[PDB]
Design a protein around this ligand. Sequence first.
Ligand SMILES: [Ca+2]
Length: 218
Amino acid sequence: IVGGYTCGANTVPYQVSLNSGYHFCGGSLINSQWVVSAAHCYKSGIQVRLGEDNINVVEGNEQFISASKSIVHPSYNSNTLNNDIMLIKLKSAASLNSRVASISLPTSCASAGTQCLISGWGNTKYPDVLKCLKAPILSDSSCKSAYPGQITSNMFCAGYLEGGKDSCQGDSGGPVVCSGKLQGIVSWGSGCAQKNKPGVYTKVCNYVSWIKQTIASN
Ligand SMILES: [Ca+2]
């Protein structure tokens, strides 16, 4: 997260840290046993860390649960990054508090200019404290204006054309929550915080059926 601010301890209860010895990706707790992340963050061994703020110091609110299942979206594309979405099933049921809570799936797709909240432990140019960012949802055409012929259907732009505020490496798989709903997943972009190159996010609105089906199937 570039050009953002320190979130404040446990104000983002759904925000989790994907770990394999060291933080590499972020994620979103959508129910007690399932973390949603990015398909390009996939690896054999994944430990999901919840209730975090400083991931370098044990502060006494963390939950360390390994992943039972790592289900990459069947139609994931490695080049176009189409369907950059992945599901994680925890080894044990996560204990939900006020510091560890779920985030609601898209009730519907969000309007253009919807104020969102992006968060993650990614690069600011990795920090230790969680970084917060408030950015609006850009229109589909403006998203295609920035990325000509690169934007698919399951992608939208959330951020700024002015530059300075964007998601980056390490924030991948992180949440983009707009009005109580997880609308975007940190996917890709041309570097970070560059002008007219905002972050592209996986459109979670189009996967509620897929996500729910996968949960019921596992
Ligand atoms: Ca900690």
